Amino acid sequence: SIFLRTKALGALPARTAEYEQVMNFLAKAISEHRSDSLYITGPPGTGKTAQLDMIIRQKFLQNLSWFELPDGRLESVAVTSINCISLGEPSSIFQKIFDSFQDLNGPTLQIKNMQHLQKFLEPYTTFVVVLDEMDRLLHAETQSVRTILELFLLAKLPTVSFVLIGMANSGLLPQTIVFQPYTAEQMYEIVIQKMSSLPTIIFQPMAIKFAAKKCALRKLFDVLRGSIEIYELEKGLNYIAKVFSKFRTRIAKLNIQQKLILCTIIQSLKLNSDATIDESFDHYIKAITKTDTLAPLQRNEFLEICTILETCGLVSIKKTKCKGKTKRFVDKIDVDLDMREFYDEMTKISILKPFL
Amino acid sequence: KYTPFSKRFKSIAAIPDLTSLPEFYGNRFENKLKTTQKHQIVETIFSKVKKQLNSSLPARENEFASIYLSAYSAIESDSATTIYVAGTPGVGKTLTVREVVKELLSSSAQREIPDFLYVEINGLKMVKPTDCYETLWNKVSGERLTWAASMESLEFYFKRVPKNKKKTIVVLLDELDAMVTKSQDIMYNFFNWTTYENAKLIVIAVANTMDLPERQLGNKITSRIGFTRIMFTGYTHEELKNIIDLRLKGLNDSFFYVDTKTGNAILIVRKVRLRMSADAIEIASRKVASVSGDARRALKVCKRAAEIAEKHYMAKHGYGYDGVQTVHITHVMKALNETLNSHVITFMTRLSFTAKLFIYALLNLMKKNGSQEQELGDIVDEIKLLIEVNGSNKFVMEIAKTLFQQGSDNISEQLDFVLNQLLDAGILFKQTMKNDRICCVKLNISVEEAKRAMNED
Numbered sequence: 001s002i003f004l005r006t007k008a009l010g011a012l013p014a015r016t017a018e019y020e021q022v023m024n025f026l027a028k029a030i031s032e033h034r035s036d037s038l039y040i041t042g043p044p045g046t047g048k049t050a051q052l053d054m055i056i057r058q059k060f061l062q063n064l065s066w067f068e069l070p071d072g073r074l075e076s077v078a079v080t081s082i083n084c085i086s087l088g089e090p091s092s093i094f095q096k097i098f099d100s101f102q103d104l105n106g107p108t109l110q111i112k113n114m115q116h117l118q119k120f121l122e123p124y125t126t127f128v129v130v131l132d133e134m135d136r137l138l139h140a141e142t143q144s145v146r147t148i149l150e151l152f153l154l155a156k157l158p159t160v161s162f163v164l165i166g167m168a169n170s171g172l173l174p175q176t177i178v179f180q181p182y183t184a185e186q187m188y189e190i191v192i193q194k195m196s197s198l199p200t201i202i203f204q205p206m207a208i209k210f211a212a213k214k215c216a217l218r219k220l221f222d223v224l225r226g227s228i229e230i231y232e233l234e235k236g237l238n239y240i241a242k243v244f245s246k247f248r249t250r251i252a253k254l255n256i257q258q259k260l261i262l263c264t265i266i267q268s269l270k271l272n273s274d275a276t277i278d279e280s281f282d283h284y285i286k287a288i289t290k291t292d293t294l295a296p297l298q299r300n301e302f303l304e305i306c307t308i309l310e311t312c313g314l315v316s317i318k319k320t321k322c323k324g325k326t327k328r329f330v331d332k333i334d335v336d337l338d339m340r341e342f343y344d345e346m347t348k349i350s351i352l353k354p355f356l
Numbered sequence: 357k358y359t360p361f362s363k364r365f366k367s368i369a370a371i372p373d374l375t376s377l378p379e380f381y382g383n384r385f386e387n388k389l390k391t392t393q394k395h396q397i398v399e400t401i402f403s404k405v406k407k408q409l410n411s412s413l414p415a416r417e418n419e420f421a422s423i424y425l426s427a428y429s430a431i432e433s434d435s436a437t438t439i440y441v442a443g444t445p446g447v448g449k450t451l452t453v454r455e456v457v458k459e460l461l462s463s464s465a466q467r468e469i470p471d472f473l474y475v476e477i478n479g480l481k482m483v484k485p486t487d488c489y490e491t492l493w494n495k496v497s498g499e500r501l502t503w504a505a506s507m508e509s510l511e512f513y514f515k516r517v518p519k520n521k522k523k524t525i526v527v528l529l530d531e532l533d534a535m536v537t538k539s540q541d542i543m544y545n546f547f548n549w550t551t552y553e554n555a556k557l558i559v560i561a562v563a564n565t566m567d568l569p570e571r572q573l574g575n576k577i578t579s580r581i582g583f584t585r586i587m588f589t590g591y592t593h594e595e596l597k598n599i600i601d602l603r604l605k606g607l608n609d610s611f612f613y614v615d616t617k618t619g620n621a622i623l624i625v626r627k628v629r630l631r632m633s634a635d636a637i638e639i640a641s642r643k644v645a646s647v648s649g650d651a652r653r654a655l656k657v658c659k660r661a662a663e664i665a666e667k668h669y670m671a672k673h674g675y676g677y678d679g680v681q682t683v684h685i686t687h688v689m690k691a692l693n694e695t696l697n698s699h700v701i702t703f704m705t706r707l708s709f710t711a712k713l714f715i716y717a718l719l720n721l722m723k724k725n726g727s728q729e730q731e732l733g734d735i736v737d738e739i740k741l742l743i744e745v746n747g748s749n750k751f752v753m754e755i756a757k758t759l760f761q762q763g764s765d766n767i768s769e770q771l772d773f774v775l776n777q778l779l780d781a782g783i784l785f786k787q788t789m790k791n792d793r794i795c796c797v798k799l800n801i802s803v804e805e806a807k808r809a810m811n812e813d
């Protein structure tokens with residue numbers, strides 16, 4: 001089936017501007033045997049991990065391969081992949097590198113810090129490491145920047161051969177490269193490049209152009225995959241618009257009784273600013289008694305209506321303190337909606353006026 | 357143990373097929389809770405109604421077809437996806453996913469889709485938040501490792517292992533908000549594995565709020581879940597009607613053989629017919645949907661209404677435990693009135709004079725200064741001030757000898773039982789202070805409902 005292979009889907013498309021800059025950093029560190037640290041930043045979704053994994057899976061003591069120099073030579077290059085979030089402690093990052101480079105047949109030594117790791121790379125061979133997400137290495141200013149500062153000094157001194165290529169998330173400083181996000185024309189080329197192995201293309205050229213500009217890479221994959229599951233569940237240009245609309249509305253989904261309490265919640269926050277659940281219940285009772293419409297409700301059932309607004313996403317209830325003489329812990333009520341859409345939905349029924 | 361899966365074999369190609377191993381993917385406490393019965397359980401005509409109304413899919417059509425279609429396009433195609441389920445607590449979130457896995461298990465036996473393994477991981481059913489790695493590794497591999505060894509073993513298995521020697525794994529992430537930690541390392545690892553090529557892992561996350569990744573999680577974990585989210589809308593008034601009628605389809609409007617000796621009813625000696633009024637179902641499902649739309653609340657209302665009617669039916673006849681039974685609207689209305697009522701008002705009206713005087717003295721101090729924070733020394737001075745109002749009259753001095761001397765000449769004029777009583781009842785509050793004069797006293801309940809109890813005395 002053509003619908004099963006489409007939903008499942010060394011130069012990456014829309015990335016030739018940064019691929020040449022990445023390979024240029026290794027042309028001076030393996031050929032000249034110089035240690036240097038690299039820093040890669042950018043927002044999540046720019047394809048940083050997919051770019052580094054493609055180079056190792058193409059043009060690249062366990063874990064030993066060969067790298068092709070531009071002039072034409074051969075060198076023993078060891079490339080490994082170690083994630084920072086997939087560890088237990090940030091201070092034990094030196095032991096994982098030893099297990100990924102040293103063979104299992106030899107003796108397994110224990111590494112404590114820099115003094116135990118620098119002596120191992122002295123006799124040796126270009127050791128390439130890929131530290132993904134280096135922002136989590138800090139200890140959540142003096143003791144926080146300790147693992148990053150120690151790893152940077154290990155890949156800066158000579159006499160050894162250790163390169164460092166990290167991929168963070170947005171005179172011995174690393175080369176910072178900002179990953180530019182994909183635009184409308186950049187996201188459209190990757191779609192045709194990834195689906196080039198498929199014989200038939202059921203997508204329209206005008207539908208991918210709309211999803212590429214509205215998402216400006218992980219967000220685009222969820223949009224195209226959702227259009228296939230929707231079309232196959234009911235049996236084009238309109239297929240791309242249904243994925244952005246299926247994922248004023250929160251007010252019409254409520255009852256008339258819940259709208260009366262909600263109208264009194266925002267009213268109490270205007271003439272009193274900071275208000276609690278006990279003060280909001282007293283303002284709602286005295287507001288409906290002057291109109292003499294609808295039966296009142298007890299304080300025990302007052303929290304049931306506010307729970308509906310919290311689940312939908314209209315009233316945020318937090319726990320703070322007071323500001324007066326009795327500064328005790330109390331439950332405060334707050335909102336997070338716009339005043340333009342609030343004064344337009346309740347006015348269409350033409351049944352409530354003093355409650356707004 | 358402490359050895360991860362990366363050091364179990366020699367290389368990548370040296371790993372054999374995991375599907376032909378009698379240990380991967382699952383390849384004694386039900387006998388001690390059994391005893392012999394030396395009597396006979398007499399079941400009345402209302403016993404079968406309560407058992408069918410218990411929690412142990414006609415109102416879910418679009419939600420059941422969306423989850424089933426998301427997994428059918430990934431298991432057969434050998435891919436990985438992430439399904440997000442959010443809604444009100446009690447709308448059939450876990451039951452909808454359980455029906456999808458149960459429907460996919462029947463299609464796998466017909467040689468249509470490849471075999472998969474269903475893993476149920478609940479966040480609230482675990483003591484430590486890091487215990488989810490040991491449960492998943494024990495159901496897939498079969499070994500017993502720690503939280504640090506199971507985390508590194510799942511990463512090496514969901515990446516370097518090819519698809520020709522793997523198998524689809526369906527993991528239901530029940531209670532997604534329970535696994536939220538501070539470092540956000542467990543939540544990110546469970547969603548990053550679905551983005552890998554050689555993964556074949558189906559993750560179905562079930563939470564309670566649609567804006568959970570946008571409030572607790574960051575931009576990195578939100579981009580790995582997906583933009584398409586399934587919102588489980590609560591049940592209204594026309595959907596809860598067929599839910600109760602389905603559980604009591606073969607019991608409603610049916611004749612029973614209730615015995616006049618013991619009270620045992622046999623579903624097809626008198627021919628007692630059980631019928632439940634349709635108006636009692638409409639007035640009960642409308643009140644449930646107007647509060648939160650809980651599916652368990654709609655079944656508990658009819659169960660509580662049948663329990664009250666069964667109590668009056670057994671007491672009027674004298675049966676025991678060892679013409680037409682019609683459940684009117686009175687039993688349903690009484691089942692909802694026992695919960696919406698407030699017992700705080702009637703609690704203060706049955707207190708003693710010493711407990712009622714402390715509440716009346718606290719409310720009078722609030723109308724003089726208006727600070728909502730009266731000290732303990734002001735309540736004592738206000739109580740004595742109300743006693744000396746008419747001290748010259750013989751009608752008021754009769755209570756002064758008891759509250760200050762207990763009717764004894766040897767007992768001196770006093771200046772703790774009613775103070776600590778209201779503190780444990782959730783009505784009165786007291787700050788942590790070593791002094792008994794400047795200690796502020798605050799009210800926890802409302803002020804409107806507190807004045808109604810003082811006027812009733």
Ligand SMILES: Nc1ncnc2c1ncn2[C@@H]1O[C@H](COP(=O)(O)OP(=O)(O)OP(=O)(O)O)[C@@H](O)[C@H]1O
Binds near residue numbers: 415444450
């Ligand atoms: N269509 C239905 N008909 C009858 N009962 C239903 C139906 N849908 C759901 N239920 C009931 O809903 C109950 C709760 O289901 P589920 O485990 O999915 O809960 P939930 O929505 O995740 O929330 P919570 O368990 O936190 O209240 C089940 O015990 C089941 O009996």
Ligand SMILES: [Mg+2]
Binds near residue numbers: 049050
């Ligand atoms: Mg990445």
Ligand SMILES: [Mg+2]
Binds near residue numbers: 449450
């Ligand atoms: Mg559940």
